Amino acid sequence: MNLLNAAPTPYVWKYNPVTGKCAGAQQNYGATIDWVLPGGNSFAYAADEIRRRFPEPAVTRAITARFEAESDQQPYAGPHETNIITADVVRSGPPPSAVYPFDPSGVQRVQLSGGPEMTPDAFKYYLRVQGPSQEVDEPGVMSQRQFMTTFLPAMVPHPFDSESPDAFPAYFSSVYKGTNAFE
Amino acid sequence: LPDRYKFSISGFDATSVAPTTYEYMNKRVPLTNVVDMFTNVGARWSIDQMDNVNPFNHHRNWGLKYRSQLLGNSRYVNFHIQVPQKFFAIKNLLLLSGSYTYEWVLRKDPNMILQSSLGNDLRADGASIIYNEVNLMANFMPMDHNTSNQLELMLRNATNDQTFVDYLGAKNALYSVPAGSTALTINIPARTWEGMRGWSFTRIKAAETPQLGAQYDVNFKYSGSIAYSDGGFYLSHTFRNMSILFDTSINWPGNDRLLTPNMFEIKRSVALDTEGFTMSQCDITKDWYLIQMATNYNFVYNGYRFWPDRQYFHYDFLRNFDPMTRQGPNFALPGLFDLVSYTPTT
Amino acid sequence: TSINWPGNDRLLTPNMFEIKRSVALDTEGFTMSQCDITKDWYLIQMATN
Amino acid sequence: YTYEWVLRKDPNMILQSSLGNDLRADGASIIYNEVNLMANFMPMDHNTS
Amino acid sequence: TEVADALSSHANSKDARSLRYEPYANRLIKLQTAMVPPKVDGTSERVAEVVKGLAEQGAIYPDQMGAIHSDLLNRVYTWNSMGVQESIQALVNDVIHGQNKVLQDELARTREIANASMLTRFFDSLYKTVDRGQRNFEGFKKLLRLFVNNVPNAEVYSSGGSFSLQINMGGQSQNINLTNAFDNLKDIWGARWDAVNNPRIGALLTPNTRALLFFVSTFYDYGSMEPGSYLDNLMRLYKEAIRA
Amino acid sequence: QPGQVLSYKKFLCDNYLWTIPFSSDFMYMGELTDLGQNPMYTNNSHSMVINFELDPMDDPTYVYMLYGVFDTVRVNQPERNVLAMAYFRTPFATGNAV
Amino acid sequence: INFELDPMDDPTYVYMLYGVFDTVRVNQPERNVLAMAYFRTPFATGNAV
Amino acid sequence: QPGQVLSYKKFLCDNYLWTIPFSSDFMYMGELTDLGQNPMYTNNSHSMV
Amino acid sequence: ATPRLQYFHIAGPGTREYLSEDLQQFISATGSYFDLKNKFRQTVVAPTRNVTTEKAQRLQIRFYPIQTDDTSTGYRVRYNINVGDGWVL
Amino acid sequence: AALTPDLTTATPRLQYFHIAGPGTREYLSEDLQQFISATGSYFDLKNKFRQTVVAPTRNVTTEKAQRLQIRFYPIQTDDTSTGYRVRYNINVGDGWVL
Amino acid sequence: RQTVVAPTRNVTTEKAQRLQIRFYPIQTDDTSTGYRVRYNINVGDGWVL
Amino acid sequence: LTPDLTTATPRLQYFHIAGPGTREYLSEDLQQFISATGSYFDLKNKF
Amino acid sequence: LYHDSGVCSGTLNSERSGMNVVVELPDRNTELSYQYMLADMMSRHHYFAL
Amino acid sequence: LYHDSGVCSGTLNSERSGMNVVVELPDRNTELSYQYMLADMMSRHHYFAL
């Protein structure tokens, strides 16, 4: 066979979880088959067929989204979590069925040790359920799973040949020249 | 004065008691010429014989002077004190409804819990403590239950929950430096430094520093001011220089930022000085002086100036950066016999 | 560089695989099998084996 | 830029006494060996500078 | 010149008493600069525009911007004549042509980039700094920007300098103008929401302005504006009115 | 004689604890410094060496080196008496003996 | 990976074993034609093209 | 001897004029207090001792 | 909000909303050299509603250890902070 | 609809701990911020929610090698009895500001 | 070769769930013949003990 | 030699003795610059 | 109090969530952090005997 | 430094435009100006050795 027509190893991405920005991509050497010294002609074709059978990025995106859906740890509460978040807000604060005395006497009230308005459970849950005041995510930073949905591992044949894309190791393009920078 | 500048009193003998006992410090008179009325008679000059001696271990320590007199004039004190919680995660935590159990263990080491103005071994001096009752006081706002449940419910919401940081914001590493040694190398494993704030460093005497994370330090026989625990730093001098190399050979400044680009020359001797590199009428360097003023006061490129807005801080630069200068006779000359002896006959 | 692998509050010691601890220095327990091996480490080893 | 300045050598000008005595008659003197000029430059980005 | 519009107006026009309420020196300075206008040198700014366009077009790097500009000032001043100044103006018109040609590119991309670019030109087309309430002004500009970006059917255009905004609700499309709204929004940035200002500037707001900031406040933060301003506490009400 | 004298320029600085900011211009520009979010250190591993030379004392001492770390806690209390704290330190997350 | 060890009195290694699938597939497609292809999943040694 | 000593905890307070705020939570919530407008005292006579 | 209190601005509206609007401009304009802002009283009124329980509630609670387990090196104490609903600690 | 993010797996680890987050004014809920503003003179929660100012990290300090401090020796001295002159050639290089 | 493959879904939580809980005694009653202990095993929802 | 002393600019306004004010004679870019970089490298005292 | 000690630390935790939420590291400094926090919060020449 | 002396003043100037752009008048007080400015910006009891 011809190695120029052989499928290249995919570029896997580095997430950099703390900053949240992409840490770049690398040649996926961590999962490679040893096939030229021991394998020869019988295994060169096999390794090529394995490499070109690497899923296209859309398929990998679908697989990763399906894997993430079965987590049980989605960012927002599912029926299991929201049922108990409703249950504890229901049993929080002054009880609704507690018949207590309201004494509007400007002399000689009762002690009322206990243990005339009340808040409804709808608003009580509304306080607990509402999100931040931002309601929009800052650009650049992404969580692990939203980074996995985008930025997918893919075979990139002939990458360093085009007009002016090169690659994204760690940079910030400024002057129309790809300035891999932040040194 | 340090023990090396003292002598016995003709009835006292060394090795009979530890050098960290009270009657050892009492029965060792200092040399009378190492400091006296003629010691640099016209110079505002900290005694170089005690520049490395803890100044907070002094009977003029007004803070400890007040702290000791709050317990009484006797050594038999029925103390009743209120100690704040200081762990950053729970220092200002605002607990909501529920049942919480919160246990904590209190030191019984006299050297740890008590501070002497002399730094003697309190365990060897018969000091001890007994805790009779330790109760936990809590104040609760009597706010309306119709609103505190609302308040607790807007605090149970995950988008708005408490976040607490340690004010120091510094990992603490103690690197041993023996007596005769003058250099120290701090190598660290490979790391990402993902949000590092910078470096802070002084040197603390190992005799005044307890074992870290120790239930009870047995080699700690000192009861003065632990400079590690409090801010009682007094050895910010005795740093000739320092260098940073993030990789094996990559200096962090590494852009000819400093006048000595490969090192943070904190101070250099003015006697050997030829090119300058000494600022504020002392031996601190131009490079290091800019580093300190830029860090604390945020304006060095617009001009050096004093910053009264941070004098209260008690831990900034300008309030306690004290340069001094003396002249001294030049001995090792035909005259000028240096008639003051600093070595006792022991 | 900072994501502990268990990282889900699995172990009684949150940020390490504490294999053993000094029982004389021990205060809160966390030692298994009448020796200085920890509850967490004993759990991991027996689960693995 | 060319920036020149001249330094005083008068003992009464440059030196202050707690008595105010004439220092020229009292042998006060000064000799300048190195008078160098220093400056601080902000390393602000050349793009924005 | 407010002197010209103070002379040629009614008896006590707003700028006929703006000069009046100035101190004597400031009023005299305005009077002098109106009567005998001081001349201004076009170059050393046109050259700056040329070098900024050169760096923007990628011809030169911004690191060498100032050096190139000053060398060009040498080359101009040592030959400053009618014939070189026309070349300077030709290069400035060249910069303008290039900028407009670039703009025509983003009006051909996705509409959510076209309206964003037109909004950037609108922002460049008015004042960039206000004497009072600058934080309110930039917070409003950012809120409007992200409102246009996050509303898929927002369409920004210009009609003779009047930058309008179209919002299509399917069955209807309410048009709100931005030039007259921002003109009305002057001296309301530094508002200081309190008892007397609310009647004062509640009758100062046109239906166009209230509609604009009502639509903008659908994406409104507590970290957008000054925490005690009239615009801040007005968008606080309008956002929850939209919500409920 | 003037040739029989010397100079002893010296400084004392108590309660200070020399600080060096991990900022590209040594001026405070936020707690999360200029280079602490520079993705040449954050993305890429580094192993620094810090070299000191000190005035030699006569007694064993430590060198109390304080790095710059973001040790924060996010205290989450989702239900009644359900208390959970999450600890995070940015440069030194493992918190081991270094 | 971070380790804390009891300090011994002689130089020692730390025999670290990861978990890998270091497998072989042996192909003999024809007579006296032998061919293997080695694959190790996490810490792959192999051929990047 | 420790049994032959006593303790005399005491405090001095000069120029203070002990104050008790007529507020619900004993804290400053406005110069006109919480209970100063409660329509128990304001609207009905009470005779404190 | 008694009119007797409002007339003396003890429980009244407040300075910014009862002075003549021209006077507020005047006192603010001449506020750097001829201060008149101390001559028109204003009182901050307490919330007086929905801010404090009438329920008999302890203002300051003492917690004493369930377990002590004293030893020669330290002195442990174990507490149990019971925070009921409507209580925030 | 309720938010249930698990920490120690939050994944950004900076935004969640507000080390490099949005800011306290814009991550606390509407109602909680209103509550803090209203009940902010007697019962303080401002210190219980962390906010960090972030360095500009771009176009504010060059990676180029620039000297922070430059010493200018005299080019002409002309020492006399009454005064001491010094003449310097101060150079502010390309892209430099002094 | 034949390899046993783990389920990897719907078998283990990704939530921060403590893998081993130590229950302090609520209430003790230490006597001379017996030592009582009373615990509160609060098995949260979704947990199995 | 400057193109401003050549013209009829009032002396008080030219030297900002009775001029308009730094908020309104500086270029609108420079006010933003000095405000943005006002915490570490101030330029406000130079105008 | 035994701060900074991971071998003899304190313990704060709830009942439903039995895991301890107070973890202390030997490389932090609780006491010095309070000293720096308090000194920045107020001048240190003030004497607060409580 | 020879301030406010027109006979022995300094000279700051550029090269292309060699005109001296510092003029010191004998009727001004530079040192007292610095004294008043420095006393206004901050209290004078602070001892700044630099």
PDB file of N, CA, C and O in Angstrom, chain B residues 212-233:
ATOM      1  N   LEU B 212       4.968  20.808  62.023  1.00  0.00           N
ATOM      2  CA  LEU B 212       3.708  21.084  61.349  1.00  0.00           C
ATOM      3  C   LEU B 212       2.772  19.888  61.439  1.00  0.00           C
ATOM      4  O   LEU B 212       3.179  18.743  61.226  1.00  0.00           O
ATOM      5  N   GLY B 213       1.510  20.163  61.750  1.00  0.00           N
ATOM      6  CA  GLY B 213       0.523  19.103  61.870  1.00  0.00           C
ATOM      7  C   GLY B 213       0.878  18.073  62.918  1.00  0.00           C
ATOM      8  O   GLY B 213       0.666  16.873  62.703  1.00  0.00           O
ATOM      9  N   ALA B 214       1.420  18.513  64.048  1.00  0.00           N
ATOM     10  CA  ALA B 214       1.865  17.623  65.109  1.00  0.00           C
ATOM     11  C   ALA B 214       0.883  17.680  66.267  1.00  0.00           C
ATOM     12  O   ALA B 214       0.476  18.767  66.689  1.00  0.00           O
ATOM     13  N   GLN B 215       0.498  16.506  66.771  1.00  0.00           N
ATOM     14  CA  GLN B 215      -0.366  16.457  67.944  1.00  0.00           C
ATOM     15  C   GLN B 215       0.314  17.091  69.148  1.00  0.00           C
ATOM     16  O   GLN B 215      -0.323  17.813  69.923  1.00  0.00           O
ATOM     17  N   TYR B 216       1.609  16.835  69.317  1.00  0.00           N
ATOM     18  CA  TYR B 216       2.374  17.400  70.423  1.00  0.00           C
ATOM     19  C   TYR B 216       3.843  17.342  70.046  1.00  0.00           C
ATOM     20  O   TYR B 216       4.393  16.249  69.883  1.00  0.00           O
ATOM     21  N   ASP B 217       4.474  18.504  69.906  1.00  0.00           N
ATOM     22  CA  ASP B 217       5.878  18.579  69.526  1.00  0.00           C
ATOM     23  C   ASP B 217       6.742  18.464  70.775  1.00  0.00           C
ATOM     24  O   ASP B 217       6.638  19.292  71.686  1.00  0.00           O
ATOM     25  N   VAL B 218       7.596  17.444  70.811  1.00  0.00           N
ATOM     26  CA  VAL B 218       8.449  17.222  71.970  1.00  0.00           C
ATOM     27  C   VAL B 218       9.766  17.984  71.866  1.00  0.00           C
ATOM     28  O   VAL B 218      10.345  18.356  72.891  1.00  0.00           O
ATOM     29  N   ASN B 219      10.253  18.228  70.650  1.00  0.00           N
ATOM     30  CA  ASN B 219      11.465  19.012  70.458  1.00  0.00           C
ATOM     31  C   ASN B 219      11.210  20.510  70.527  1.00  0.00           C
ATOM     32  O   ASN B 219      12.169  21.287  70.507  1.00  0.00           O
ATOM     33  N   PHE B 220       9.950  20.928  70.602  1.00  0.00           N
ATOM     34  CA  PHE B 220       9.600  22.340  70.721  1.00  0.00           C
ATOM     35  C   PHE B 220       9.654  22.719  72.195  1.00  0.00           C
ATOM     36  O   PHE B 220       8.740  22.413  72.962  1.00  0.00           O
ATOM     37  N   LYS B 221      10.733  23.382  72.594  1.00  0.00           N
ATOM     38  CA  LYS B 221      10.949  23.811  73.968  1.00  0.00           C
ATOM     39  C   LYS B 221      11.099  25.325  74.035  1.00  0.00           C
ATOM     40  O   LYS B 221      11.977  25.858  74.716  1.00  0.00           O
ATOM     41  N   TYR B 222      10.235  26.030  73.313  1.00  0.00           N
ATOM     42  CA  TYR B 222      10.267  27.480  73.203  1.00  0.00           C
ATOM     43  C   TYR B 222       8.852  28.009  73.375  1.00  0.00           C
ATOM     44  O   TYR B 222       7.898  27.411  72.875  1.00  0.00           O
ATOM     45  N   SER B 223       8.715  29.129  74.087  1.00  0.00           N
ATOM     46  CA  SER B 223       7.394  29.659  74.404  1.00  0.00           C
ATOM     47  C   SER B 223       7.266  31.145  74.092  1.00  0.00           C
ATOM     48  O   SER B 223       6.355  31.800  74.607  1.00  0.00           O
ATOM     49  N   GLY B 224       8.144  31.692  73.263  1.00  0.00           N
ATOM     50  CA  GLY B 224       8.038  33.092  72.913  1.00  0.00           C
ATOM     51  C   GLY B 224       7.023  33.308  71.814  1.00  0.00           C
ATOM     52  O   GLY B 224       5.906  32.791  71.888  1.00  0.00           O
ATOM     53  N   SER B 225       7.396  34.063  70.788  1.00  0.00           N
ATOM     54  CA  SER B 225       6.507  34.366  69.673  1.00  0.00           C
ATOM     55  C   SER B 225       6.865  33.461  68.501  1.00  0.00           C
ATOM     56  O   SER B 225       7.909  33.642  67.866  1.00  0.00           O
ATOM     57  N   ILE B 226       6.000  32.488  68.212  1.00  0.00           N
ATOM     58  CA  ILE B 226       6.178  31.653  67.031  1.00  0.00           C
ATOM     59  C   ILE B 226       5.878  32.496  65.802  1.00  0.00           C
ATOM     60  O   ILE B 226       4.715  32.780  65.500  1.00  0.00           O
ATOM     61  N   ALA B 227       6.930  32.894  65.082  1.00  0.00           N
ATOM     62  CA  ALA B 227       6.760  33.735  63.905  1.00  0.00           C
ATOM     63  C   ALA B 227       5.973  33.037  62.806  1.00  0.00           C
ATOM     64  O   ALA B 227       5.423  33.711  61.930  1.00  0.00           O
ATOM     65  N   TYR B 228       5.924  31.705  62.823  1.00  0.00           N
ATOM     66  CA  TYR B 228       5.118  30.979  61.848  1.00  0.00           C
ATOM     67  C   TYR B 228       3.630  31.206  62.085  1.00  0.00           C
ATOM     68  O   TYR B 228       2.881  31.517  61.152  1.00  0.00           O
ATOM     69  N   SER B 229       3.185  31.054  63.333  1.00  0.00           N
ATOM     70  CA  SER B 229       1.758  31.114  63.629  1.00  0.00           C
ATOM     71  C   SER B 229       1.219  32.532  63.500  1.00  0.00           C
ATOM     72  O   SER B 229       0.166  32.751  62.893  1.00  0.00           O
ATOM     73  N   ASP B 230       1.918  33.506  64.069  1.00  0.00           N
ATOM     74  CA  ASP B 230       1.486  34.891  64.004  1.00  0.00           C
ATOM     75  C   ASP B 230       2.282  35.628  62.930  1.00  0.00           C
ATOM     76  O   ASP B 230       3.045  35.027  62.168  1.00  0.00           O
ATOM     77  N   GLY B 231       2.108  36.941  62.860  1.00  0.00           N
ATOM     78  CA  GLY B 231       2.837  37.730  61.890  1.00  0.00           C
ATOM     79  C   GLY B 231       4.110  38.329  62.448  1.00  0.00           C
ATOM     80  O   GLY B 231       4.665  39.269  61.872  1.00  0.00           O
ATOM     81  N   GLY B 232       4.587  37.788  63.566  1.00  0.00           N
ATOM     82  CA  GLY B 232       5.768  38.319  64.216  1.00  0.00           C
ATOM     83  C   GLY B 232       7.062  38.014  63.492  1.00  0.00           C
ATOM     84  O   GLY B 232       7.979  37.429  64.074  1.00  0.00           O
ATOM     85  N   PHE B 233       7.154  38.408  62.225  1.00  0.00           N
ATOM     86  CA  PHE B 233       8.362  38.179  61.447  1.00  0.00           C
ATOM     87  C   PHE B 233       9.430  39.200  61.809  1.00  0.00           C
ATOM     88  O   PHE B 233       9.150  40.395  61.938  1.00  0.00           O
TER      89      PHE B 233
END
